[PDB]
Subunit: 115 residues, 3 copies
């Protein structure tokens, strides 16, 4: 229906704060958390993966390489899955952009220890 | 409708015998052979591939790597495609689990001659 | 509805000339340009990619490796995307087959400078 699950009380507060973009006027809302869950199940991917910091990582991994080959439907996903994942880990970005940079750098560190 | 095609007379006998799980009470039935064919065509994959030992291998190959990234919809597939494939090859497992081990080991042998 | 967009006036002329096959009697028509656009959006891929020589390349890249693992739905795509791409680049093949050879050879050249 429209209840909490993916994000807890504390996460919800920050979530509503985070904005979809750095230079916008539309904060994040449950509409985005559910909008992704629906598109997820469509790709044979349960929405529960978003409720777990581990499940999200698995999703971003498939969408990562499918960022250029993927379509708009995939782009939006990476946006939500990003801001959400950051919440489950620790990163408390203000927008969806900052979340992309953080996750982008974290991957660059592993490159040195996984080349 | 509900006739034979993927599995012949002899294969049908063994199929009905094989169980979906090692510790269960629900043997295999045509319902599972058709249930997969439907999900197959959905992924741009003709159900006929299951009627051929060659087609199955091609399917298990894509689902193999998509076992962790894939969703529940993919899991069930690997289960049926497994028990079925084993029938077309030679392996006559009793459950779906044994089929996974057999196919798992067969792949380990090639690793030594394809590393 | 049924207007021009992907192929311009000049491209349209050649398009209608090109045949789906070398030994057939069914030339190409808008029906094929739209038929693909529909299947594209289904895979999270905007149909606009076909209107751009760059977008097409990105599509053929994903379908390339998915030529054997992919289903019939993918085959038809590679057929249209091929004849179309050739138009945006320069190749003016007469059928869909010739388009496959041209794109096949072009990739062989890069192999020598990208092995
Ligand atoms: C007399 C009254 C006259 C005024 C009323 C006349 C109509 C009127 O309202 O103004 C037109 C428009 C603003 O209205 P408008 O609804 O088109 O605003 C843009 C629209 O929402 C886009 O979808 C946004 O980009 P995206 O979805 O996030 O990609 C874009 O954001 P930004 O990201 O740009 O901030 C928004 O500016 O002005 C411009 O700034 C366009 C500059 C080009 C910018 C577009 C290039 C991104
Ligand atoms: C049962 C029916 C249920 C469906 C109807 C329920 C409501 C519904 O329509 O879906 C919600 C929404 C799409 O609708 P929605 O109008 O909110 O679409 C977004 C909105 O226009 C933003 O302003 C765009 O960013 P910007 O102005 O250019 O910055 C953003 O573009 P992209 O640039 O993201 O492509 C658009 O996706 O889904 C998502 O994809 C959000 C993922 C987070 C992405 C936002 C992070 C940028
Ligand atoms: C007074 C009468 C009181 C009795 C009636 C009260 C209700 C009652 O019938 O008993 C409860 C239940 C058995 O009934 P219940 O329908 O829940 O049985 C389980 C259910 O079908 C699961 O979906 C099966 O796992 P999966 O889909 O294949 O994954 C699981 O199989 P196994 O694979 O476990 O054999 C089944 O046991 O007992 C337990 O054994 C649970 C232990 C935890 C096991 C679950 C962890 C897998
Ligand atoms: C037009 C509508 C047609 C659709 C309605 C037609 C009937 C229909 O509903 O679909 C059939 C069936 C799903 O329904 P169905 O209730 O049989 O689902 C399975 C059943 O509950 C088993 O007991 C589960 O295993 P276990 O108790 O935990 O061991 C198994 O889980 P997984 O662990 O497999 O996820 C479940 O999938 O499809 C398949 O996926 C079978 C693939 C073989 C998988 C079985 C091998 C484990
Ligand atoms: C008294 C009147 C009797 C005559 C009326 C009796 C019925 C009658 O019309 O003739 C039968 C048939 C021609 O008619 P028919 O509609 O079946 O023609 C074939 C049909 O359209 C296939 O789908 C085409 O292959 P694909 O979709 O592109 O793959 C095939 O093309 P090609 O690519 O073969 O040119 C077509 O020939 O004859 C043969 O040539 C078959 C030889 C085997 C060829 C099939 C192997 C590809
Ligand atoms: C809203 C509903 C809209 C849908 C209804 C609108 C009309 C509609 O039905 O779809 C159009 C068409 C499929 O229908 P359509 O009857 O034209 O199908 C093709 C036709 O039979 C050819 O003769 C076949 O080649 P050949 O005789 O064996 O040589 C070709 O096979 P393949 O060998 O290609 O598999 C068939 O796909 O789509 C495409 O895939 C064309 C892609 C270009 C492929 C052609 C290049 C070979
Ligand atoms: C929002 O309220 C989340 C609930 C998701 C919808 C559940 C629908 C009801 C479950 C039982 C119906 C199954 C019919 C046998
Ligand atoms: C079970 O009976 C397997 C048959 C699959 C359904 C076939 C449907 C009938 C074929 C002709 C209908 C096409 C309409 C032009
Ligand atoms: C063929 O004519 C190409 C046009 C594609 C269909 C567009 C449908 C009309 C657009 C506005 C409808 C949206 C409802 C708010």
């Amino acid at each position: 229906g429209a209840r909490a699950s993916v994000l807890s009380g504390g996460e919800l507060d920050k979530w509503e704060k985070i904005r979809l973009r750095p230079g916008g006027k539309k904060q994040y809302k449950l509409k985005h958390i559910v909008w992704a869950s629906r598109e997820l199940e469509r790709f044979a991917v349960n929405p529960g993966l978003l409720e777990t910091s581990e499940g999200c990582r698995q999703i971003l991994g498939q969408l990562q390489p499918s960022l250029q080959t993927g379509s708009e439907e995939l782009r939006s996903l990476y946006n939500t899955i990003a801001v959400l994942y950051c919440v489950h880990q620790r990163i408390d970005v203000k927008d969806t952009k900052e979340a992309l940079d953080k996750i982008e750098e974290e991957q660059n560190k592993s490159k040195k220890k996984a080349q």
